[PDB]
Amino acid sequence: PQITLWQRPIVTIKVGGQLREALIDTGADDTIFEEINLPGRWKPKLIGGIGGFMKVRQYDQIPIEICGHQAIGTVLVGPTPINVIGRNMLTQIGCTLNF
Amino acid sequence: PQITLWQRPIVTIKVGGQLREALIDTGADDTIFEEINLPGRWKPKLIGGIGGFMKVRQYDQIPIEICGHQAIGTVLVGPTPINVIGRNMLTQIGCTLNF
Ligand SMILES: CC(C)CN(C[C@@H](O)[C@H](Cc1ccc(F)cc1)NC(=O)O[C@H]1[C@H]2CO[C@H]3OC[C@@H]1[C@H]3C2)S(=O)(=O)c1ccc2nc(NC3CC3)sc2c1
């Protein structure tokens, strides 16, 4: 779809067998969710944002469905105030900005 | 223009008579710059992001040029790790997401 920006660009996600909502976030390099339970090994990572840093778990090669489009890639799990779909996944679904 | 997401979507800005670069950030409600000097009255604001909160100065009705497009609106000034153009300005330049 085309999505305008009058409201937060929130879409429906399936990840790890669970359903969530997440913000299409062109300012995010990576994809971050709070309150998901992913399988297998992970690696602790510190990431920076406004406000400072956040410890996350880094999971690699995770399948995700983003508004009906399939992608796989790294998902970070940690205390973000809103789930975000970052460019690592957006590039796989052909998402672009236009003005 | 159309902008893909293989790299950070950074554009050239003029704000307060000064030239800067900033990220087109659909995950940002508001527009934030570090290291700009805006004229006139402002109001202290705490904003949240990953990592926690950040104190900013809130300036209203600030003209900005974003990749050659004119907008006016609220600009927040404070210690962000990267300057961001948020939806308050993106809607005025007709920016949309597409996939
Ligand atoms: C640069 C920064 C913009 C990136 N963030 C993405 C922005 O879109 C976030 C999304 C957001 C919204 C709300 C919220 F509670 C928390 C986050 N917006 C945000 O803080 O907005 C703030 C601010 C703007 O006005 C209002 O709107 C929401 C809120 C309020 C004040 S990030 O979440 O820090 C992030 C994401 C992925 C990522 N991947 C990395 N990988 C490492 C480098 C290789 S580092 C990294 C850092």
Q: Whose CA is nearest to atom 14 of ligand 1?
A: B49
Indicate the Cα dihedral angle B64, B68, B70, B76, nearest 10°: -20
d(CA A52, CA A59): 22
The residue in chain A having the minimum alpha-carbon distance to the alpha carbon of residue B9 is: A26
Contact between B65 and B75 under an 8 Å Cβ cutoff? The reply is: no
Experimental method: X-ray
Q: Point out the residue among A27, A54, A99 whose CB comes nearest to the CB of B93.
A: A99
Yes or no, beta carbons of B49 and A50 under 8 Å apart: yes
**Mutate which of A29, A53, A84, A95 for ligand 1 pocket (most atoms within 8 A of beta carbon):** A84
CA angle A34–A35–A36, rounded 5-degree value: 100
The 10 Å Cβ neighbour count of residue B30 is: 19
Resolution in A: 1.2
Strand partners, A66: A13, A69
Burial grade of A26 (CB within 10 A; 0-12, 13-18, 19 or more): buried
Ligand 1 proximity of A56 Cβ (cutoff 6 Å)? no
Which tokens sit at A87? 């460019």
User: Domain range for residue B94?
Assistant: 1-99
Q: b/e map of B37-72 (b: 16 or more CB within 10 Å)?
A: eeeeeeeebebebbbeebebebbeebebebbeeebe
d(CA A87, CA B5): 6
- The domain tally of chain B equals 1
Q: Point out the residue among B50, B52, B97 whose CB comes nearest to the CB of A24.
A: B97
Question: What is the CATH number for A28?
Answer: 2.40.70.10
Helix or strand or coil: residue B91?
helix
